[PDB]
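Issue: ligand-bound run for zinc ion - logging full I/O for the record.

Environment: standard queue, default settings, no custom constraints.

Inputs:
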Amino acid sequence: MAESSDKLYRVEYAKSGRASCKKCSESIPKDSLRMAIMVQSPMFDGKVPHWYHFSCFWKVGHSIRHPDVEVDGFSELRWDDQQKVKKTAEAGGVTGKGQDGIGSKAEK
Ligand SMILES: [Zn+2]
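Outputs:
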């Protein structure tokens, strides 16, 4: 849509293991929660997402101050994940090792 990437931040559930972590240099599991950052591309004519694990956003260490505005894709999350993403932004981040999965079929 118009100005779809005029944000800083993205959050969503992972449909498949096609995204890779720009922060811890591993790959992101499917049927799990992930975040990304909106950066101006050297290779593309606009803003592009830098994907990483949900905990890895808070290892990049950015603050979020109006999360339902700044975190694109938050509208697709269910209430328990919306409450946890907003609570994590109020809490100043959560930074643990996260999932044991990496992007494979039936990895849970
Ligand atoms: Zn990671």
